[model samples]
Target: KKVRIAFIAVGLRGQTHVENMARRDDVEIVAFADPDPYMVGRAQEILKKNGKKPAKVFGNGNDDYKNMLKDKNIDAVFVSSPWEWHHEHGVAAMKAGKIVGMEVSGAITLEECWDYVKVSEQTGVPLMALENVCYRRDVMAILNMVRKGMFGELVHGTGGYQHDLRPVLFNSGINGKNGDGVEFGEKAFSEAKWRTNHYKNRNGELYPTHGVGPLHTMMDINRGNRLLRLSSFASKARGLHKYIVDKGGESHPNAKVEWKQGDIVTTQIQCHNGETIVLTHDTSLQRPYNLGFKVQGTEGLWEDFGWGEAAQGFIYFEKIMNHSHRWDSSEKWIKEYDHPMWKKHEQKAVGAGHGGMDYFLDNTFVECIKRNEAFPLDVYDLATWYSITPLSEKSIAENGAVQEIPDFTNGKWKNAKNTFAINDDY
Candidate 1:
């Protein structure tokens, strides 16, 4: 059986997925969508260049998606819209009897997560969160190593999305909130005029997946084990609003940004599983890129980065008092059969984005859907993965009150029945 896919939100990111899907003979993209005609034209051009003949193209926002969902020929829908519309569009697709593969910020709150679960159940279709971070070669390798008991009692881990926003705010038009009409308020207006201010003064791992993906793999989050309740707090934003004002983002006066914007910039989360995750969104900070995810277990420790020599993400073992014991970094993490996902696509894992992880991630997503079985990641995973954002912010808005970790799974999400096969060993 062949899978006919329809891609929505065909901009730069959307085109990337469209191109990859077109490459696979197993999948056929029946139509394309975007709010901009130019973007749709560009996508058609790119697909034609890649040998795809002319197909029906769809544009416009919420309505285009609903129309596309009406086509029975379309087996699946891939969403690449702004974070705010993810839940709405995703549920729409699923409700229309098509599987949904949504990108980024999959679910905001547990309530939204339940929405996905209920829709999936009612429609008997799958809703997948397209998080490419988990597919990183280095990260996947670490995941397999942990499963092999090399990490030993994997105690705690940390991860985050810590890209400073000054340059990007003025440049790329990408920020915490992408699709919203209003960017920021007076305090946040100076940051920029184009991007949204949904991130300011929020708490709870704001952007958890990038930093949380590897941690989820290591700790098996939602794979039988689930994250318990969490508490979040934000630090004062010193010049975030001032910087925004300097940028003259006050144009959107009607869209008032929340108060206490400049004073709060960071939020830390404590997972009830005794595993803690730190989530921060500091657009105001001037610093280097850091996904600050470090895993420390009884026998080993691995950190994605640090200031100096700590950059390699080393896994350390305490000195064992013995006549002779080898303490080698290679032995600590470089397992011969380390990364299962990498081994699944070892040939292509080197040059793909984020060290070929993105390539594997895309392929893995398609493969899981094609097989119609459980993969390491799924919608349940996605909901839990993104729930960190809203939960944290919800906590902050409630005076630092701890919020319940959303059970992304509705009453019927099968408990990851080990029905699929994973034989790859890198």
Candidate 2:
């Protein structure tokens, strides 16, 4: 029987997820819910485009979503809501006895991250964070290289979300789509809710996972040592609200945006085994996108992606034994089986999203639900992946001081087995 799935918040992310699952014959989407009328309309279009039979749609009202929990046939729920609400919606899904596949930035706060972890453990239900980066082709390839000793004694790594969110800040949320003044008033109240606390953060690596993910792949962070204490700090605000106001914020009248929303959050995470990761999330920066997966090991160095010069999603490598070489070393370097995640799903993946990970992530979740087996991304990994929000905040709150990485395992991380295995050389 097909695994029955329900989707929450069928906005941009939700639409994509629903579409991905709809294409799979193994999954059946039985219901949909969203707070935005426009989002509901869009989700219907998504269902139509995929040639899926129309399912019950819920919109705008709180009870509509609450009512969905009563459906005993729903085997899973796809959560893709705003940051503040992930916990509330996700926890409820677990309580409803449904598997949950959450969108990116899986956990907003450490406490919330733990809530999901504990609930999944108590319920024996799978909660998978859609950390698509871990499935990117280059990232998976790097994992293969690391396992095969292509990058010997992997030592250091880096990751970040350098996207220019300044323009987006002017949009989305209270400051969403209107004149600048409208944006400001909305931003001020919104800031009081989330930004005020985020600004007080000092850790240098607030947004480090993008660039750090590949490094984690290579270093086997949880598999090997685990993240240790680290520090974080953000870049100064450029007074975007003021400029937004100068352009025409005041005329809009409805807004009163005063200060910039987010700091250039940066953080450094140290692994217990002595490796370090540098993460940067400069929402204000207007630079070209880059996630510098720079990694160096004792024998050689490898980057998951990026030439660091071309700056266009390039993954370069430096081998001590094969300097000044061409792709001839594709034989020597790209270990097909080095990365276990990639090798395991090579036959089933087809570049659906993020190096074809969406397919694997979605397919695997369906199978886990259908068969009721242990999940690929278990509870412990979920905690480790989501720990960044809390740990980085603590570092910043403590005056850019280092904070110890919490043990995601209930003391079983060491005993937890690594089931991912690769058979090819990329």
Candidate 3:
């Protein structure tokens, strides 16, 4: 059976996903719901051009999405809405008896996290948080090696979204296409205005998924291990304010507006299995784009500092490259440990966004739904990863007091298996 999909919020990210999924032969694009009529019309055209039939379109009315959710013809709901809207759309889709694949974002509040857990558990409808970084070629290679006992027992992992989004915060990036006037009121050009609003009000690890997703998978979070407690701290907030003043000469409407989010927020998490993880949120600072990904284990370590065109990976092992006592090129190790899924779909994934990770992310979700198997990134994984946002916020607000992470699995994690397809054993 073809997996029928309904898309919510077909703006930038949602529209890109529609195009990617439309290219696949295994799913049917059944409907699109967006507040913007222009985006809906553009998406319809994109679908038609891709040789797919025109799908039902719904304008951005609050209840218009409900109509689509109630449709028996739709098998899954793809949520690409703003950070604030993810919980609403995700819970509603599950209540309506459809599987949901939501774009990644940190939860705005802790309550939102529990609501998703409650509905997913009550409805029997599965949810998959579409975290694309887990499928990155190098990340997946490291996962393969870990499962093959290359990393031995995992000890720690660290990464974060450290890209400078200064242009984006001011609605100046890409000719203001993302301007929604988050800072300037109605003059913004993109829906990113809302995204900017988040930075204005929140203070903890606002965007943790891109960094934590692969780490969770590497450590088998929510499957065999769980995050026990976390502590977070933030530096003073200044980057966006400075950027506004510098660009607009202090006379700009947004010049004096304070951004509550810090220039850098750092978090430390302790897992139940005695493993530790470090995370950072540094969008407000001057820095080259970097995930700052590093994984260390009893046997070896893998780290990638690559961003944009200058790509690089480094690996060190006690036995493999210990003779030199220096960082060895990851090329040899990555090539040797290339994940089977990537090896199978390398050609198709080449031009896909985010270096083919997006392709595997969408493909894996659809394939799991069609096969009626539990998704590798199921509800427990979703809850564990997204909960970091609110937990970190609470910890930082309390002056870095330790905050306990809720056990979303309700003790079931003890026996739950790591079923994601990345494993060679699977």
Candidate topping TM-score: 3
lDDT of 2 by residue, 252-338 (tens): 552343332244666777786778787777655566655656666765555433422222232334554456543233323445433
RMSD for each of the candidates: 5.2, 4.9, 2.4
Q: Work out the TM-score per prediction.
A: 0.81, 0.81, 0.94
Q: Considering every candidate listed, which one attains the maximal lDDT?
A: 3
Task: Residues 1-426, candidate 3: write the lDDT tens digits.
Answer: 778898988877787789888888888899998867767877888798789999888884856888888799999989998788888889999999989998888888888888888899999999998988888878888888998998889999998988887766666433326422324334453444577888877899988888988888889888889889899999999888887776666877677678889899999999889899999999877887889999999988888887611137788888866567788888878888788988778777785433377888888888888889888888777777788999888988899999998998899888888877654322
TM-score of 1: 0.81
Query: What tens digits encode model 1's per-residue C-alpha lDDT throughout 116-138?
Result: 76777777888766667666555
The C-alpha stretches of model 1 lying farther than 4 A from their native spots are: 106-110, 171-195, 200-205, 242-273, 306-311, 319-338, 349-355, 410-421
Clashes of each: 13, 38, 7
The regions of model 3 sitting more than 4 angstroms off are: 172-186, 308-311, 351-355, 423-426
Ten residues in sequence with the least summed lDDT for candidate 1: 185-194
